[PDB]
């Protein structure tokens, strides 16, 4: 017997993703995490979207 | 009326009745809504932001 995920994971656009989808026709998932790392000066994210 | 000398003729007009008919002139103006507008107004997906 193996343990398997019981449900589909959920991917949600953040409101910044709404703004950039409308304006630039593009999305950067985890926009705020890129933002916070970039201003903090840190080069590595813990994981991807 | 002005009462006048007995020899001068005159008239007996006390009132006259005059009828005015209303003149009709309707106005109109269109406004247009797209099928996409009606879809997003009416069929509110629960969906996302």
From Swiss-Prot, chain B:
Disulfide bonds: none annotated. It is found in: Virion; Host nucleus. Homomultimer. Makes the hexons and eleven out of twelve pentons. Interacts with triplex proteins 1/TRX1 and 2/TRX2; adjacent capsomers are linked together in groups of three by triplexes, heterotrimeric complexes composed of one molecule of TRX1 and two molecules of TRX2. Interacts with scaffold protein; this interaction allows efficient MCP transport to the host nucleus. Interacts with capsid vertex component 2/CVC2. Interacts with the small capsomere-interacting protein/SCP. Self-assembles to form an icosahedral capsid with a T=16 symmetry, about 200 nm in diameter, and consisting of 150 hexons and 12 pentons (total of 162 capsomers). Hexons form the edges and faces of the capsid and are each composed of six MCP molecules. In contrast, one penton is found at each of the 12 vertices. Eleven of the pentons are MCP pentamers, while the last vertex is occupied by the portal complex. Belongs to the herpesviridae major capsid protein family. This is Major capsid protein. It comes from Human cytomegalovirus (strain AD169) (HHV-5). The gene is MCP.
């Amino acid at each position: 017997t193996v343990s398997a995920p019981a449900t589909y994971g959920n991917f949600v656009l953040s409101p910044e993703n709404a703004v950039t989808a409308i304006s630039y026709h593009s999305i950067l998932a985890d926009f705020n995490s890129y933002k916070a790392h970039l201003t903090s000066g840190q080069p590595h994210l813990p994981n991807d979207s | 009326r002005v009462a006048s000398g007995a020899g001068l003729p005159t008239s007996r007009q006390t009132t006259i009745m005059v009828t005015k008919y209303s003149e009709k002139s309707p106005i109109t103006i269109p406004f247009e809504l797209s099928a996409a507008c009606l879809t997003y107004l009416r069929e509110t997906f629960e969906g996302t932001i």
